[PDB]
């Protein structure tokens, strides 16, 4: 178990999996709908 010191590069994920991401971190993670593909980007900030 390690704490991320600086924000990780965004990765593509499904809406169901990305909303889940938010349920753990939520101050520490960031998720957005990609308008064209309807999927979500998952970006882990510092402190994750």
């Amino acid at each position: 178990s390690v704490f991320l010191d600086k924000d990780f590069t965004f990765v593509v994920s499904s809406e169901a999996d990305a909303r889940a991401f938010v349920q753990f971190d939520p101050e520490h993670t960031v998720a957005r709908p990609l308008p064209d593909s309807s999927d979500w980007e998952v970006t882990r900030k510092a402190g994750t």
Partner: protein, 46 residues
């Protein structure tokens, strides 16, 4: 088919130059959160 293959690589480089420089000026990318649309969607729902 297209000889342009190295012109695709030449796009990637300045993107890195762009991205790195953008972080120095603290210009924030990927700032879109849940603020406006769903509230409007809630209003449009009512």
């Amino acid at each position: 088919s297209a000889a342009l293959g190295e012109f695709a690589e030449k796009v990637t480089g300045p993107d890195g130059v762009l991205a790195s420089a953008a972080r120095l000026v603290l210009n924030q990318l990927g700032l879109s959160d849940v603020v406006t649309t769903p509230e409007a969607a809630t209003d449009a729902e009512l």
